[PDB]
Amino acid sequence: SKLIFVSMITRHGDRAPFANIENANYSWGTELSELTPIGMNQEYNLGLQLRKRYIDKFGLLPEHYVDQSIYVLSSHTNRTVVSAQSLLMGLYPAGTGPLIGDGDPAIKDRFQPIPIMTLSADSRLIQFPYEQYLAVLKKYVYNSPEWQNKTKEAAPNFAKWQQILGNRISGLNDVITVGDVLIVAQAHGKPLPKGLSQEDADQIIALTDWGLAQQFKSQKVSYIMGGKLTNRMIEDLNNAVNGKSKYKMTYYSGHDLTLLEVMGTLGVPLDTAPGYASNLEMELYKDGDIYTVKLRYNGKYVKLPIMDKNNSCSLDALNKYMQSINEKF
Amino acid sequence: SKLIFVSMITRHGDRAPFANIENANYSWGTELSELTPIGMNQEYNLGLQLRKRYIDKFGLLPEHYVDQSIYVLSSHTNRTVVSAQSLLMGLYPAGTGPLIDGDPAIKDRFQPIPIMTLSADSRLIQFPYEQYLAVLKKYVYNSPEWQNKTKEAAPNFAKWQQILGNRISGLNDVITVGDVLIVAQAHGKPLPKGLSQEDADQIIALTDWGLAQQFKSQKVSYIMGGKLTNRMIEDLNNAVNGKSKYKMTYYSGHDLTLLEVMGTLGVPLDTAPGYASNLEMELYKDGDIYTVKLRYNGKYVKLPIMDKNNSCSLDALNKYMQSINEKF
């Protein structure tokens, strides 16, 4: 049996936050929302790992980039485009890029350009538009029993956290908001805000992780946001078999929500929010007329309900499974 | 006076053709329509030149890339995206990328710089093909200049058609096969059997002529290029009015992109843009006074509104553009 195609999603790398904690004076060294050098490195290193897997180990892809062999599509953000470019600098590193004339590099250090397309800012494929995302949350998530129950558990801390941080804290949505800043701060080794104990920070961050993952424990929420991309990836698998496409890999450069919504759509929602450079791969194998699929998330195979002891299923089975999900929603 | 902002358009680099000459067996080593290694190199070298100009000479941009300092937008094609990436590899080369104790974020200190792409149906940088041909049919193919040149060339159509195998029944078809001959020449391929160098030269010369001729019409130029021309001037204004902090906006495009903007501004090119051709709108500040210069392929261009020094005020450029708009 031979690996013949892979479709991949990544979360982007380490970034600055989007917002600030009112009562702190963090300086990030990069603009709000932008990928940091740490984030570029994380994606670059994932790219190196993917080269070891899909080039060295499986030989799905060649050592030197073949034009039109990989389709890369990113959401319309600097951080996801730069993450994809960084990853590709690991997948096809300096030294492997094309030569011209008599073995002279097309680009110094034999860099390999690989085209990245971006969706429009209003595309819902990879990143659901923010106001629409919040609307989905308000409608399906915020008033759900799990959300309400967790809210009551955490609510006794809101006044304190609010006075400490200066930011409004009147619900879990606000905790998630400031929680991101605390996550970035920790990732960059910043001190805690004055008066925020490590214990309090840990609680906020844990609620943030919980909140993000909880949203997609609903297959309906996952499908609303993620059904389009999930269908598309499965269609990519099919196009590798039906002769409609010659790509060896399709790669969607996205966000934590992108991973959460696809995993959630497939009925295997994540228990923890994806860390930086988390990634998912749908692998298609061929043994004669038999086609089998495996699903890999952060380095480990994932067992869909339809898969066997070996974390595998026929492509036909995956298709039927997806068809039923579609009919369900 | 200090340079404070630049808006730039490029044509992409050397590429394979889009179609084949029927009676030839060329092998490009690159998929049809894709940028070649030669093309990556051309854009990379343009990037190096732009570093020497806008970083080293004018100091508009710093030696190490600053996030959100340059906005890059490409048409929805591999060749224009790869061209922009290659150029940026020259503008901010290996060795200048970020560190994470002085260890490179990416091996060889590569510098990623984000590139956004328009949708395939955007008309900003590349007019959609069918719509483009419709504009040509409507405004260009039946124009007197086009008809007259067609009559000059027509006595050769039968010969060229039998030689090449491709249909040749008008200048549009000459332009079509002409591109293949241009690529073949750029890659040192032999001539198709039975096509003399003289014939090849005529076809290529007609191709260059035809592409430029389309945009000698300011109306055609405006239909296709008015939107981008306005956007670039708006970029200049946003550098002054505080709305934008970009030092440069860069539109990665095609020969038509350059032709349509130049044609819109009333300075249509006489020659079709070669690979990695480029245009820059430069904005200068001397105190409260703002001046603009227009550079195409390394040389300043004199708009009708410009003075002896190939310069005009930004106010003048705005008024000039406003009139063009009102005109169309």
Side-chain angles (χ1 to χ4, degrees), chain A residues 1 3-101 103-123 125-130 132-137 139-185 187-219 221-234 236-243 245 247-288 291-299 301-302 304-308 310-319 321-322 324-329, chain B residues 3-100 102-129 131-136 138-184 186-218 220-233 235-242 244 246-269 271-285 287 290-298 300-301 303-307 309-318 320-321 323-328:
Chain A
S1 188
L3 179 66
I4 60 165
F5 182 83
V6 178
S7 185
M8 182 175 66
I9 297 167
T10 60
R11 176 183 185 205
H12 58 70
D14 185 277
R15 53 156 174 78
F18 302 96
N20 280 335
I21 286 169
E22 278 303 322
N23 288 339
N25 280 303
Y26 294 132
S27 88
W28 304 114
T30 113
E31 296 292 345
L32 299 179
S33 84
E34 296 291 332
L35 202 76
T36 59
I38 286 172
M40 296 175 184
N41 184 253
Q42 286 167 345
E43 296 288 351
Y44 165 69
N45 278 296
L46 172 53
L48 289 180
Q49 290 154 209
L50 293 167
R51 172 161 191 101
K52 292 174 168 60
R53 180 166 177 84
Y54 296 118
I55 292 168
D56 297 338
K57 183 177 189 287
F58 289 103
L60 168 60
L61 289 162
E63 287 154 319
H64 303 93
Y65 180 72
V66 169
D67 292 325
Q68 307 185 342
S69 66
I70 301 173
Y71 183 72
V72 187
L73 180 65
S74 178
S75 56
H76 195 97
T77 78
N78 290 341
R79 61 194 175 280
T80 52
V81 168
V82 169
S83 286
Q85 194 182 8
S86 299
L87 182 155
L88 296 163
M89 292 181 186
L91 182 58
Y92 281 103
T96 69
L99 301 173
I100 58 176
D104 286 320
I107 299 172
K108 192 155 171 296
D109 296 306
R110 286 183 73 180
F111 173 71
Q112 175 70 62
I114 296 179
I116 296 159
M117 296 297 116
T118 65
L119 295 161
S120 73
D122 45 32
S123 171
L125 183 70
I126 291 177
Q127 194 185 35
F128 220 66
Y130 190 67
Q132 299 176 40
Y133 164 59
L134 292 188
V136 167
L137 296 191
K139 185 176 185 187
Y140 297 102
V141 176
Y142 291 163
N143 299 310
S144 74
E146 291 88 349
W147 202 265
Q148 291 189 164
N149 288 341
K150 176 60 62 173
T151 287
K152 293 194 189 292
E153 181 186 318
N157 295 307
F158 295 173
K160 176 176 63 178
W161 293 341
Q162 180 170 282
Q163 178 69 346
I164 294 160
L165 304 176
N167 299 59
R168 178 194 79 189
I169 312 280
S170 62
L172 290 189
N173 61 337
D174 294 344
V175 173
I176 292 165
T177 294
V178 304
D180 186 66
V181 185
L182 291 182
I183 289 171
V184 177
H188 283 78
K190 301 292 187 191
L192 292 162
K194 296 169 183 187
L196 193 68
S197 69
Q198 188 62 63
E199 178 190 6
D200 276 328
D202 287 349
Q203 289 178 18
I204 294 170
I205 293 170
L207 279 169
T208 296
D209 188 315
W210 182 89
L212 292 172
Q214 183 60 31
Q215 297 171 13
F216 297 90
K217 291 291 176 58
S218 166
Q219 192 176 17
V221 168
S222 299
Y223 188 93
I224 293 177
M225 297 180 51
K228 189 178 171 60
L229 184 54
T230 307
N231 274 295
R232 185 171 174 158
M233 294 180 76
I234 290 166
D236 287 343
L237 270 34
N238 283 303
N239 291 340
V241 171
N242 68 20
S245 171
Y247 294 118
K248 300 297 189 202
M249 166 186 286
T250 56
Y251 162 32
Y252 301 93
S253 184
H255 307 259
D256 47 20
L257 302 192
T258 315
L259 293 168
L260 289 156
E261 63 192 21
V262 172
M263 293 294 285
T265 291
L266 289 170
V268 288
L270 301 173
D271 283 324
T272 69
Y276 293 126
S278 287
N279 52 279
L280 170 167
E281 292 86 41
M282 296 188 189
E283 295 170 350
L284 180 63
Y285 296 84
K286 180 185 174 168
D287 200 327
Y291 297 91
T292 67
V293 180
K294 298 192 82 165
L295 205 221
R296 205 161 166 84
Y297 176 74
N298 283 3
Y301 285 119
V302 176
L304 296 185
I306 60 172
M307 286 172 171
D308 61 10
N310 298 144
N311 301 308
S312 66
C313 61
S314 74
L315 180 58
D316 295 336
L318 208 201
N319 279 319
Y321 181 67
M322 186 71 226
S324 73
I325 290 167
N326 287 332
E327 293 167 2
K328 189 177 192 180
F329 311 102
Chain B
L3 181 66
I4 62 165
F5 180 83
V6 174
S7 185
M8 179 174 69
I9 300 164
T10 60
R11 176 179 186 208
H12 57 70
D14 184 276
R15 52 155 174 81
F18 299 96
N20 298 301
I21 281 165
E22 279 306 309
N23 286 344
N25 287 119
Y26 292 133
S27 292
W28 306 114
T30 298
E31 295 293 342
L32 299 179
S33 86
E34 297 289 333
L35 198 78
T36 58
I38 287 176
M40 293 172 188
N41 182 254
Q42 286 166 346
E43 297 288 351
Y44 164 72
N45 278 292
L46 172 56
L48 288 185
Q49 293 154 210
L50 292 165
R51 172 162 189 98
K52 293 173 166 61
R53 180 168 178 82
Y54 296 121
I55 292 169
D56 294 341
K57 180 178 176 188
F58 284 107
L60 166 63
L61 289 165
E63 287 155 322
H64 309 268
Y65 181 71
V66 170
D67 289 326
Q68 308 185 344
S69 67
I70 303 172
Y71 183 72
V72 188
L73 180 66
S74 181
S75 58
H76 197 97
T77 81
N78 291 341
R79 59 196 177 279
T80 53
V81 168
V82 170
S83 287
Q85 196 183 189
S86 300
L87 184 153
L88 295 162
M89 293 178 189
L91 184 63
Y92 282 105
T96 70
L99 305 172
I100 53 176
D103 289 323
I106 297 171
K107 190 184 179 61
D108 289 338
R109 287 186 69 177
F110 171 74
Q111 175 68 62
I113 294 173
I115 296 157
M116 301 291 122
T117 64
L118 296 161
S119 72
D121 26 55
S122 172
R123 285 193 280 275
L124 180 72
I125 291 179
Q126 187 180 42
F127 220 65
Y129 193 62
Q131 299 169 40
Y132 164 58
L133 294 187
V135 167
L136 295 193
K138 185 171 187 191
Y139 294 103
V140 178
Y141 290 164
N142 300 311
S143 77
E145 300 80 359
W146 199 267
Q147 286 185 189
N148 287 340
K149 178 62 69 167
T150 291
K151 292 196 189 299
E152 277 192 328
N156 294 309
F157 296 173
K159 176 176 60 175
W160 294 340
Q161 180 170 278
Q162 180 71 340
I163 291 163
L164 304 173
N166 301 60
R167 177 195 77 182
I168 305 290
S169 58
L171 289 184
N172 58 341
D173 295 344
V174 173
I175 292 162
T176 294
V177 302
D179 185 66
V180 185
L181 291 182
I182 292 175
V183 174
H187 284 80
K189 301 292 189 190
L191 293 158
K193 297 168 180 184
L195 190 74
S196 64
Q197 190 60 66
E198 195 180 59
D199 273 331
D201 287 350
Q202 286 176 214
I203 291 169
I204 293 174
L206 282 171
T207 297
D208 182 336
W209 180 90
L211 289 175
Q213 183 59 26
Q214 298 169 12
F215 297 91
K216 289 295 173 55
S217 165
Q218 192 179 24
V220 167
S221 296
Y222 189 92
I223 290 167
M224 300 180 51
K227 181 158 175 278
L228 183 55
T229 307
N230 275 293
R231 178 166 182 161
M232 291 179 75
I233 290 165
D235 289 343
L236 269 32
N237 285 309
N238 291 341
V240 168
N241 63 22
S244 170
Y246 294 120
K247 302 294 192 203
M248 169 185 283
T249 57
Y250 163 31
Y251 303 95
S252 184
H254 308 255
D255 50 19
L256 303 189
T257 316
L258 292 169
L259 291 156
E260 64 193 19
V261 173
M262 295 293 284
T264 291
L265 293 168
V267 287
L269 304 173
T271 306
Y275 293 127
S277 284
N278 52 282
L279 76 71
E280 292 85 40
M281 295 189 191
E282 292 171 354
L283 178 67
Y284 296 85
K285 181 179 178 174
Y290 297 87
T291 62
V292 179
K293 303 193 80 164
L294 211 216
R295 204 165 168 86
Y296 176 77
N297 283 1
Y300 285 121
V301 173
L303 296 185
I305 68 177
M306 282 174 176
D307 63 10
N309 295 141
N310 300 311
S311 72
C312 60
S313 75
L314 179 55
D315 297 342
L317 212 200
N318 283 324
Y320 183 62
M321 186 72 225
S323 69
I324 293 170
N325 287 331
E326 295 164 353
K327 185 177 190 179
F328 309 101

